[PDB]
Structure formats: structure tokens, C-alpha cells
Curated annotation (Swiss-Prot), chains A, B:
Induction trigger: Part of the yhcYZ-yhdA operon that is induced by the two-component regulatory system LiaS/LiaR in response to cell envelope stress.
Signal sequence extent: none
Protein name stated in the entry: FMN-dependent NADPH-azoreductase
Stated family: Belongs to the azoreductase type 2 family.
Enzyme Commission identifier(s): 1.7.-.-
EC top class, as a word: oxidoreductase
Amino acid sequence: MNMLVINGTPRKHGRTRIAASYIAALYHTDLIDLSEFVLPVFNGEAEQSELLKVQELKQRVTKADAIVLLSPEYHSGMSGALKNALDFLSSEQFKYKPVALLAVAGGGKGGINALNNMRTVMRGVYANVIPKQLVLDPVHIDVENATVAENIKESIKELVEELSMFAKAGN
Amino acid sequence: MNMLVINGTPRKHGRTRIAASYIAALYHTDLIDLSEFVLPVFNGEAEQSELLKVQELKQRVTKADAIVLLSPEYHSGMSGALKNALDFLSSEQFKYKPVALLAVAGGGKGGINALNNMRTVMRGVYANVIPKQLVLDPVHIDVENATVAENIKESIKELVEELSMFAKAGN
Ligand SMILES: Cc1cc2nc3c(=O)[nH]c(=O)nc-3n(C[C@H](O)[C@H](O)[C@H](O)COP(=O)(O)O)c2cc1C
Ligand SMILES: Cc1cc2nc3c(=O)[nH]c(=O)nc-3n(C[C@H](O)[C@H](O)[C@H](O)COP(=O)(O)O)c2cc1C
């Protein structure tokens, strides 16, 4: 079970980091934190494909057999940071690969548009997004303790468990 | 009538540039071409808000009284380049401002997801997206002549005309 987790939040001090950091640790996964893994804004130039960064991304993303894609909802969407990232990839690295969506909003009814966005894009690169999805609000993140609240743990378990299921049935 | 046009395509050799470049010229508008206007991937740091670039963006975007937002559909979405841009802004600069969406796909049924994406995000910053929207395929862009095909001109006229209408009724 070679799993990958991508923290779409560019902000190093962002809650999504905490969530992503919790999941990766609890499941011993690869982890691409867009706070550290900084890429340049895509520009189509193939001399950009030869960039330090970029080759590793395709490499790690294609290595994984299942992915947990996290991102904060920014202006009812996924982060520009994560979209830019994805623009470098294609259905080459994602085709038929299991993906679990998870968004980090700021409360209220925020978070679904971030999810539909991701879901649509993922389907754009032909991935296999599992049904169960999840949105984590601030009440689900314990900043002071740099980890997630108890109330949401069971949900994350079920998410990762449905991912694993699909990712296995694959073969 | 102070209008602004934003070419969401990062690629300098991209078709969206041609379209955006045509519209801006035909209507004497401001123009932010994301091929030249390169920003860094957002990161939340306020020391990024003091970046050369960033201050001008908010400035020009808030100056405009109507905006024609163009972008190519990348992985069924708007470009990471343009989303990143928008992440720097907020409902501060967009509230109630008229926006016309226009996407540049590669043919087939591509282009609507790019539009819904933008439409949702725009609504996120409280803008006033006009009803009429438009998708331009390759058959609508005359690359060799660095301009748009005749078949699509009337459509662009109607688009910009509905924008102006709304942008005026505003007051
Ligand atoms: C530019 C910007 C736009 C945002 N837009 C939304 C939004 O549309 N809906 C929402 O629920 N939260 C929004 N947020 C709040 C984030 O979802 C919230 O910060 C969350 O804790 C994720 O934080 P992170 O991006 O630092 O990980 C936005 C935050 C920023 C900085
Ligand atoms: C990473 C990437 C992803 C793309 N995804 C789509 C897509 O989902 N649907 C589509 O109709 N075209 C897609 N295209 C093609 C562009 O829409 C097409 O190039 C168009 O001419 C706009 O070109 P431009 O981005 O250079 O302006 C994609 C192109 C690239 C480079």
C-alpha cells in the first residue's frame, strides 16, 4: 500500500498543514506539503519541465497507488497553489488512481465548492475519486496542539479506509 | 467606462493571449496578461502583500468598473496561474463588480467546467457575473494571423455589450 498525501495549502501556518501532517503520520505516507514544495507558476515552457522540482512531483505522484488530496477552500475553490501544481501533471500520472478528497474551510457552509472543484479536476485527469469526501472546519483542528480534534478522527479513518478499499480492489 | 481584461493563460504562446489581446485592443481596455504579469505562488505572508507586483494587481483590478475574465481550461478548471492571482484579492476589489467570463478550450465539449469554476469563484468574492458566457475553441482563433476568427467576433461583441449594459445600470 504505497499512499501519498498532498497538502494543498501554501501557507506554512495553515490549518490544512496540520490535517495533512496528522494523516501522513498516522498512515506512514509520502507527503507533499505545498508550503515547502514550492513550484513556479506554470508557463508551458518545456524548459520548466526540466525544473528541479517538477520532475520529482510527477515521480512521487505517479509512484503512489492512492492519494489523499487536501486543500483549503480559497474563494470557493481549491488553492491556486495546488491547481498550479496539478497543471504540471496529466492523466499520465493520475489515470485510474484512487483519490480521496478532503477540504479545509473556515466554517459555515464553506468547503463543498472546494471539493466539487477538485472532484471535477481530478475527473479531468481521469482519476478515480472515491465517494466519501470530507470537510474539516476550525472546530476540527486543534491548532494549539498541532493536531486534529477527536471529533473528526473517526471520519478520517473511514475516509482513508474507503480509499484503501478502492485502491486494493484496483488489482 | 473603465474596463479591464485579464488573460488567465500563463503561456505567452497561448491562444487565450490572442483572444484577450484582441478584445483589449478593440475596446481600449486595461490588460493584465498573466504571461508577463508573473506573481509568486501565494503563501499568506503579509510580506508578500508588499510585493512589487501584488499591489498593482489589487490597484488595477479595483480601478476597473467591469472585467472580462479569460482563461484556458486546464484539467477542466481555470488556470492555476489565474487562481493564484485571485487568491491575492478578495471581495474587497470585486464586490458587485460586473464580470464577463470567457474560456478557451481545445475543442470538443471542453470549456464549461472552466466557466463554472470561474463563475463559482467570482461569486465567492461577491462579483456580479453576467449571464452570457462564451467558450472559444481553436476554430475561433487564427493563430497565423494573431487575432480571432470572424465566426466568433459577433459573439464577443454581444458579450462585451451585455457587460457594458450591466456595468452601467450599476449606477
Ligand atoms: C484568500 C483566502 C480565501 C478564502 N476563502 C474561503 C472560502 O471561500 N470559504 C471558506 O470556508 N474559507 C475560506 N478561507 C479560509 C480558509 O478555508 C481557512 O483559513 C482554513 O483554516 C484553511 O487554512 P489554510 O489555508 O491556512 O490551511 C479563505 C482564506 C484565504 C486566505
Ligand atoms: C495542462 C493542460 C491541461 C488542459 N486541459 C484541458 C481541458 O481539460 N479541456 C480543454 O478543452 N482543453 C485543455 N487544454 C488545452 C487548452 O484549452 C488549449 O491549449 C487552448 O488552446 C488554450 O491554450 P492556452 O492555455 O495556451 O491559452 C489543456 C492544456 C494544458 C497545457
